[PDB]
Design a protein around this ligand. Structure first.
Ligand code: FAD
Ligand code: FAD
Lengths: 256, 256
């Protein structure tokens, strides 16, 4: 419906209003929050991605971390070094972007959305994420909490290098303090810059909490979301497989 | 030296002479060997990759599986489904390619090469690969064996879905039967289409053969190569880390 309204042949011209570092000084990562002005012209549901065309033409996708009723949209971008120091194609472009610079978007893209009944049915959720995979969850929280008549339970597993590497820490803390009876967040730190290692640490933590995890999934009929690390998918699916199924209708995946 | 002689602005126009399926019928993968005629104009060392521009403009890299003194060059391409059934960008283009069709190349790219002294010093090798990561090793074997005065020892660990998924099986069997005192090949089958799972099976096998593996690496001063799976790197490095170092000069990596 909003899908591929803007493409590489007709991209949506936008403006950068804000560019802020998302990590604290002890993080080895370099990550930027981008505040993008689209004049209310970019159309999306929470969970969608947008394509950025560097140097506007080969677009890269980024999960939108803002919600629908926010004027601007937002995005969280890790700076990739080094190209397989040196910079990745879109990373180098983002690195040198300044506020008020033009930026061209394609989209919306993807199907990593909430079920349409979410607020009415009070659906329960498990969100699993590593690194920038938190983005779509922040946008889910803003929508679900009407950021207020959603009374379901949400559990988040989030793996990162260390404390200072937690993206959107402010939003997460806000939501947990604000709705302590609806939100439980389990942080996992790896202290390994390698992503395959990080997904071991997250699998291990779900492992250690297998009892609550399976209680939530089987008994509370959770919708389970996995994002965005490639090496996180199988390792989590392996905990459900080795214990539990046509649903298999509540697993949602967006990895890269 | 041969690096980026051809780029996206000035690509090398070539012709497809052969396109053959590399896997046998019991393989779930779809993979094509491509025989490319470059009129001796494309310059490369063994271990290099070449960029293919689909629809000639966003290029993808493919390890060259032929050797220098072969008239044509060759490449092995897995068909990626489905885009994150549907097809990946370059995959769809390769899928519909016919013999004698024009194809445009950039390169050469990369640094996954043999040490220049290889044949003189009789350097020993460990090659680790999954799926299409065998490509550069096939080209190493052709060069090293002058495909004949190389008398070093080579050990290969190669993980794939099943027997019918072994790429370049003919070449591998040729080289092992031909030089039984120089080549040892350890096949690993996962029966899992997921790549993270496959890398577990390969780690497990190196595990089981830790004694020979570490004997070859430490005592025979092997040059160690890892290709090409992303999830294979850490898992193998973890076997060297947990047991052993400024060399750390013999580890070579090309993953994706
Ligand atoms: C659905 C989705 C959502 C995403 N959301 C986010 C997000 O919210 N935040 C975020 O930071 N990232 C996100 N990503 C990933 C994002 O697109 C990365 O920024 C991007 O993948 C890296 O692009 P780059 O230009 O920085 O690096 P690139 O230049 O693309 O290089 C990165 C890697 O791609 C491979 N590569 C490089 N060149 C080639 C080539 N020529 N051919 C084949 N392979 C090559 C190499 O492995 C290299 O290490 C998302 C990805 C997807 C699919
Ligand atoms: C050094 C090197 C050597 C390689 N050698 C080989 C080889 O010998 N044989 C071989 O088969 N492959 C090889 N590859 C990988 C090869 O480039 C793949 O064919 C390619 O990565 C997939 O391209 P595609 O167009 O088929 O799929 P794509 O359309 O690129 O999609 C593949 C994946 O990229 C991500 N993606 C898709 N769209 C976007 C987007 N807009 N933004 C960000 N991410 C996106 C998704 O995760 C998707 O699943 C090599 C890669 C490298 C880096």
């Amino acid at each position: 419906n909003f899908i591929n309204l803007y493409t590489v042949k007709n991209p949506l011209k936008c403006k950068i209003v804000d560019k802020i570092n998302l990590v604290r000084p002890n993080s080895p990562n370099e990550v930027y929050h981008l505040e993008i002005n689209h004049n209310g012209l970019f159309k999306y549901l929470e969970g969608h991605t947008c394509g950025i065309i560097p140097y506007y033409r080969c677009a890269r996708l980024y999960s939108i971390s803002s919600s629908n009723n926010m004027e601007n949209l937002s995005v969280a971008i890790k700076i990739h070094k080094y190209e397989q120091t040196n910079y990745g194609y879109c990373s180098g472009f983002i690195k040198n972007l300044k506020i008020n610079d033009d930026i061209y978007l394609t989209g919306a893209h993807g199907y990593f959305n909430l079920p349409n009944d979410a607020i009415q049915k009070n659906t329960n959720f498990i969100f699993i994420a590593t690194g920038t995979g938190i983005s779509p969850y922040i946008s889910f929280l803003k929508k679900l909490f009407a950021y207020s008549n959603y009374t379901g339970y949400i559990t988040i597993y989030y793996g990162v290098y260390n404390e200072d590497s937690i993206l959107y820490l402010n939003e997460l803390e806000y939501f947990q303090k604000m709705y302590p009876n609806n939100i439980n967040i389990h942080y996992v730190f790896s202290y390994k810059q390698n992503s395959d290692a990080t997904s071991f640490y997250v699998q291990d933590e779900i492992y250690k909490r297998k009892t609550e995890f399976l209680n939530l999934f089987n008994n509370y009929k959770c919708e389970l979301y996995i994002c965005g690390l490639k090496s996180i998918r199988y390792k989590v699916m392996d905990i459900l497989k080795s214990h539990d199924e046509k649903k298999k209708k509540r697993v949602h995946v967006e990895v890269y």
